[PDB]
Swiss-Prot record:
Positions bearing Phosphothreonine: T25, T53
Effect of R14C: Found in an endometrial carcinoma sample; uncertain significance; no effect on its nuclear localization; loss of its ability to inhibit cell proliferation
Location in or out of the cell: Nucleus, Nucleoplasm; Chromosome; Chromosome, Centromere
Protein name according to UniProt: Transcriptional repressor CTCF
Subunit structure: Interacts with CHD8. Interacts with LLPH. Interacts with CENPE. Interacts with BRD2; promoting BRD2 recruitment to chromatin.
Summary of the function given for this chain in its UniProt record: Chromatin binding factor that binds to DNA sequence specific sites and regulates the 3D structure of chromatin. Binds together strands of DNA, thus forming chromatin loops, and anchors DNA to cellular structures, such as the nuclear lamina. Defines the boundaries between active and heterochromatic DNA via binding to chromatin insulators, thereby preventing interaction between promoter and nearby enhancers and silencers. Plays a critical role in the epigenetic regulation. Participates in the allele-specific gene expression at the imprinted IGF2/H19 gene locus.
Positions spanned in the full protein: 265 to 364 of 727
Organism from which the protein derives: Homo sapiens
Tissue expr: Ubiquitous. Absent in primary spermatocytes.
Note: More than 13'00 CTCF-binding sites in potential insulators were identified in the human genome.
Chain positions of all zinc fingers (C2H2-type): 2-24, 30-52, 58-81, 87-100
Length: 100
DNA sequence: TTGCAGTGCCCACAGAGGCCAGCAGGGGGCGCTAGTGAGGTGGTTTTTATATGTTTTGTTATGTATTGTTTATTTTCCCTTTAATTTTAGGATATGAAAACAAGAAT
């Protein structure tokens, strides 16, 4: 029912349309007090500051290294600890942690 | 000793193959982020629900009006007895009208 004007975005929640309009309008009100980089939400700026300094809270349960976000630890476990490999190739027997 | 037939040696430029940097092939692991997606919390209203006040409905009691009841004073229908009232002779009256007499008038 809900439709977009800038693109063919179709959702059922008005709040989803609101966020999509915020993405089109690029409301970035969160700057970094070290570099000119800016973001739209607080968690992005929090991770950016957790990269300018070493304050990595997501610790690896199987080794002693760490990362700022969860997805990086997910893929680290699928590379090094639980070799998942969901996506597989066409001809060869290849598979890896990322679609890239 | 020489000409001829056959050998020795020294060089050198090719020929060859290992040495080497350069460079491209497939694949493993990390740094970082935009953008949804979903889930949880807070606010809002809202909707159901509950309780109070007012009014409407139902019930009760009293007074008035209607129908009925045996008196009860008309009233009215029906007797036997008078009290006017009417009808029928019977005698008397009256008022008329001829009748006779008397008085003018004529012949
Ligand atoms: Zn759009
Ligand atoms: Zn910065
Ligand atoms: Zn690890
Ligand atoms: Zn393949």
């Amino acid at each position: 029912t809900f439709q977009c004007e800038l693109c063919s975005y179709t959702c059922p929640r008005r709040s989803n349309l609101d966020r999509h309009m915020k993405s089109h309008t690029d409301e970035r009100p969160h700057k970094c007090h070290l570099c000119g980089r800016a973001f739209r939400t607080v968690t992005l700026l929090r991770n950016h500051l957790n990269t300018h300094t070493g304050t990595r809270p997501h610790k690896c349960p199987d080794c002693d290294m760490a990362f700022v976000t969860s997805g990086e630890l997910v893929r680290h476990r699928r590379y090094k600890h639980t070799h998942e490999k969901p996506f597989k190739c066409s001809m060869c027997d290849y598979a890896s942690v990322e679609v890239s």
